[PDB]
């Protein structure tokens, strides 16, 4: 019982952390293997990133001109190169933490856990969705760039966010690990600035599912609805719209606690429409779309 | 920018969890140097543990560490936990530290089944001595920490769920929080409370990432903030908290007396649709001591 934000152990992502360091710049580097990625603003001058040429900034460079540390140990840069906007250098050393790993590139919606690290240190572990505008809300200071978003299934870790930038209002933007941005953003320092965003529906009702499995049901009701219907109120209260396909990967819940699809639409349709009066649900006085079918399921009771 | 509750990083935890099986009883041990800890109801309505305990032989534990079977060599009692001798001393074992935590304090949860972490959450001690956890069967024995530095100060180990779906359990020396046994009982976590020295260190970190407005021009005295903040079910504020709270009052140069006199404003008139560092919500499972390692950035 109990239902909690909860991040993916964050042990096989800290033994690939490391330290890099151009000029006077440090961020966050990921050691794999015998390659460390890390942002290519990193190799940027004050002023430098008004608009800069990282093709031009970067045949500037040696593999010297880049510092790397695993704690205090220096990792010598033996080979460099640009992907994107992502710098991967090769050192002369390999990390035999690496563990086994892929890199993906998720969908808006989906949940990840991020690992803030400092100068290549761990600060602390803490689990976010992508926004459907493809930021994050998450907490960084400065010089947490670098520091990266992962799942783990079984003793894979999919890579999926490296950390760039703080937009305007204090959201977060990235790239997944071939170094390609989610959403609009850039990394220089222009006037952009995070897009129109949704309430992330098919979340809120997994959501609703997992109250159910750990024994709650006051928000239920004895009404269905069409998806279409559904749809036409939900989309007043700015929620993404909800397709078949979202009412399909809800199935195994659905079966689970015996609460048709579209008879949770309809509980859902009457909590927008008339708030929470006061109640909770697993605790919270607000709808929560933080948690994927597949977070529920991994956490709830079977 | 951003205020998320943040887990301590895991590895140095996940690198000593483990699986203890007995008979058809399998949970999570917790192994450091060449001891490891687990619940003793890992060999179980009113059990006789030392009776019990006298039929186990070392062969009976089944001790494995990934796909390691670690050779049990000795076993005793200690308190509600058993304490199993191994033959190898764990590598990964960290600087560590057993603590007792006090009420209303925070941990780290690494929820473990079958000696395999499957996920990380901060929470609170609740002042009724219980934990609002995530567990399913099988997660006895995951443990609760802080870390300093290098040094992970181990202070919970799981035992049990409570008829409200609330959790109990002990620290590393096997002692009960609360007043809670493991037996079949119909014991029942009590009344709990809002801990008001977290909600204070909260809004003190709303104040140092500039979201202020619910400050005021007034004071008070912590008798006339307790008459006011008891009504609302919050835990009595005492001279010691307002103690606890001097480093982030020097910070923010806002006395702590003058925090509560805005406390007491935002109970007795709720936010008005406003929010605080995001949250609608007054927020009570952030220490003093998480805020200034979240706003000071310190890493481990």
Known sequence: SGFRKMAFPSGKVEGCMVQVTCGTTTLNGLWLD????CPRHVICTAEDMLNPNYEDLLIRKSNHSFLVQAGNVQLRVIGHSMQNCLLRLKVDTSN??????KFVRIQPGQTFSVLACYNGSPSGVYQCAMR????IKGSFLNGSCGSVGFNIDYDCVS????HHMELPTGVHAGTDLEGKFYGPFVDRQTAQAAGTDTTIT????AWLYAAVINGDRWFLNRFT????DFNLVAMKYNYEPLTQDHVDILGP???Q????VLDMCAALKELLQNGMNGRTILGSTILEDEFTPFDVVRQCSG
Request: positive net charge; hydrophobic residues 35%; contains cysteine.
């Open 202 to 205: 098919l979340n809120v009702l």
């Open 34 to 37: 015998d390659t460390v990625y």
């Open 257 to 260: 606690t015996g609460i048709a």
């Open 159 to 162: 890579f999926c966010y490296m």
């Open 253 to 255: 819940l659905s079966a």
């Open 132 to 135: 459907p505008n493809h930021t």
């Open 225 to 228: 609805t069409t998806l279409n």
């Open 96 to 101: 035999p933490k690496t563990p086994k790993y």
